[model samples]
Target: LYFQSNAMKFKIHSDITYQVMSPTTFIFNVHALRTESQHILDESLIVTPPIEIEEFSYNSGTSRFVRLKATENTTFSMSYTATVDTQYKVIDQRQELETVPVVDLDGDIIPFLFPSRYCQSDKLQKLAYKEFGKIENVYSKVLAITDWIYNNVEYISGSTNSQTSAFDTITERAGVCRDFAHLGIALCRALSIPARYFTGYAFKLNPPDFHACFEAYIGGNWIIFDATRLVPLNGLVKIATGRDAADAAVASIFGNASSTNMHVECASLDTDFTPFWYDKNSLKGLSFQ
Candidate 1:
């Protein structure tokens, strides 16, 4: 066996309720993985976001309560309820904490940012003259792109809003969840790799945390990657997938409809919480004889 392992568990409970105001079609994208890697396991969740929200997802994944009932002009109701024995791991690779390395990204993923009907962008067409470049494998391109963002960008919250752009983040070298994900997308597209950015929570001891990563289309499937993570699979909890930041937010009905309202914290801190709360180290693994 490549690796045989089991994870540690702790009890947890949480309940979240939302009042769906306008008519909208929401796709449930919360994670609902019951187990993984035989090290960290996903517990159980009992969430009630909206009756119209269709939850067609794998229990072994971060499932969401998506799809709103806007076609019939109906108001919705949401309430998250969960009771789980979350898993945690103490032994982790130090590389997960290390920063990524970057190479020259000028003529790579950045050029694909704009809509393309046939070939390259004006900028890409201009830079193509260099022709000194060649497309690298997915692995190589991912590493260089992530490394570039890790070294250049700062994980500062509230720095860049939802309106931020990929180019802006790359230039400023400072951004929050959206920016980090954008940098990855920008660089990946620059390298000609079709990539998607996923949005969700990575268990943490504090509320309002972020876990951003890229989904590289390779070998006929999408592989998850985080430029900032030093480990192979750290605290990645799945949620929603999109082309970039514009597709990753919570998204409302109107009036700048955006952002999925999220909060994270350890169960120990909030004693008054219910059976649907999530732990910082909730990635649970399974074992069997």
Candidate 2:
């Protein structure tokens, strides 16, 4: 016997509004400031090779709030649009799923997506491709690259700054997350694997972060490979993905480019994370962290 149930419908409405900085002001210059009588300057200039940064647009996150007029008001009124939504029903299954076979990309031609200085230089061009003498499969190759860097590359806490280059780490065989990421990217590229470099933050970290990630064309999709944080469950948040570490560079406003000290913070606001706005796919919110 079969019984039919009545269909149900629900209407959803949402409006998100908040004030950022009613009277936000900014002052920037390039007059070298002294930090504890020490200069925070990296004279070792990193001559960046020509790069195309595929990063998030300015409007990709957060909002810049302003006052109707700057005065003294405890409460401010901001307007947000009303949104309606419909969510599909959820379902549960009880059967074990079959495992799919893995596809090997052992003999595929991998191309470069970025102009890497180290990977391009005539002296180091050998790194842009496999050593030829080494005999290894894709799995072993990638793991070899990861393990080699993990052991050879020393994580020198704050030895290198943002301006440090992949070559810096290569020469010293020591660096932070950026170095490890560079090693992975370079090795993968050399071995005919299209790997992308990821840049983002790692909150709650001992010294916070400026993480680098490796995305290789494995099987089919670009699977993430973090040679640094080998543990899969370790906390890692992605901000942007690009070719090598160059693409992940965050330059807030460019500033004056000289003569001053700048402190940057990418923060998330105290949000209810409710549906404020939405695209065709799902709801969205205005927040930064």
Candidate 3:
């Protein structure tokens, strides 16, 4: 049980530069979310030119967003740094974790069961049932969905765009982490499982950048899954969670502003930090809060 008590610490940093062609407003969701299993030890944000920033929380304070307006023809830059402590609960994947029936589901969790802009669960019912309907264990069903995606879809960077949806990913069979997450969410939701999109800072991600994954609500827990398999489940620092990518976008800009440069990093601060992932042979699942 030593690993159960282990609290992993992470240092996260992000730097971005943008060219503002006109008066523009920018909303950033880079700050890590404060959740039951995650704690923010310290954090700071600095914007060049020192403009006023409006901070607000949504999704019942689980997510934080910062808004700022930059003047025309100006170069804007933002630097953010944070230290986070995260812990996860591990469960046996082979257990009979049944999906929460819609009739008995809570009001707040119902939204994740519906179709979203990127995750079209309504359209994925047939495919979902055809592939995973027979799986008795909810956790195993979700793991099967993740493996189905990883084995079928090609991880081609830039193969997908902002407009791509779960349907698109299924047809193309090629996409990045975002697409993989959407498809996983859609399949889970189609089976009446509450699933949501997850964005975070990942340790040891190649060409380090913000990462996307998905979570399914089963057996009264939101369990994490990543079809990309690019980072360990315990190695992620949560940023935001929503129905899909639209609600958790890293940055949303209005007017003419283009990113010139960006950098992201997530490093383990704990001496005992060790990376772990789901093992099919071992039948283990991971949940953070």
Candidate 4:
């Protein structure tokens, strides 16, 4: 499959207030780029009020960040454009859990196996094993978890807060894309399968803006899954990834600040490879990027 995002526009304006008339700091992760399956042909970020950046670098696996400081009552705007080529892959089969032993796990992947601020996998160990232990296949078990979440949870906007955790989402059985991702990640971890939170600009997402998904490490590689079934498995353009949303939020303000506006648009430039909403099972033989 061949796809191109000729222009993925982003506009943000925020007002900052400094109580002591000191400089306010901010870290933003609003830029998009290449990944294992996606290639960045061209991308750019433009900041207004022209503040010098302190630090800019990549965070975990494929996350990017930029830090800057501004004076009191300062309002800044950011604009970006990107042209990307996304590659698609299909998972044809599953691997047994016994094939992926603890001894073979690399050190960096250990953290994803434990609990995080939002994903409380440790608390649901019993339920996870009881529900999925018999699946045997690691890949199959993860998909089963995804299906379970879809059947149990309701997708409703404004139903959850930033402080809401995976356990809470499971209890409430309702949330947005992020909540679905958190529940999926938590359940996978409890089943002894390593998982991580993912954020992206998904193609054909309803009321589209940014989207969230989850990845599981099984059979020695990371596999993607969208429990919400809002987009095809290979239809999302990854922006940032971490243990949870805290590590992937588009912006983090140090001092008092309020965003007056934020506008984003992501569309494919190719007519032949149209990407839109589809059933999760339709991903079986599909090719995408």
> How far out, in Å, is residue 205 in model 2?
3.5
Q: Which pairs clash inside model 3? A: none
The most accurate candidate by TM-score is 3
Model 3, 1-289: lDDT tens digits are 1136477899999989999999999999999888878999999999987889998877456568999999899997899999999998886656655666778778888888999999888998998999889988788888899999999999998888889999999889999999999999999999988999999999989889999999998777788999999998899999988889888888888889999999999999888767788876666668886
Backbone clashes counted, model 3:
0
lDDT digits (tens) for residues 163-229 of candidate 4: 8989999789999998999999999999878888888876666676678888888766677777888
Cα deviation of 68, candidate 2, in Å: 20
- To one decimal, what is the Cα RMSD in angstroms of model 2 from the true structure? 17.0
TM-score of 4: 0.83
lDDT of 2: 0.39
Q: List the residue pairs that clash in candidate 2.
A: 30-258, 30-259, 31-259, 32-259, 128-190, 267-288, 267-289, 268-288, 268-289
Q: Count the clashes in each prediction.
A: 54, 9, 0, 3
Model 3: what TM-score? 0.95
Ranking by lDDT: 3, 4, 1, 2
> Against the true structure, what is every candidate's RMSD?
10.1, 17.0, 1.7, 4.5
- Residue by residue across 1-289, what tens digits does model 2's lDDT show? 1111122111111111223233322121111112221122221111122112221232322111121222222222221111111111111111211211223343321334334753332333476344421633444455556666776788777788666656566678777776777767777665555666655433233444345666655434444556665322112334455555443444322212221222212222223212121122221111111
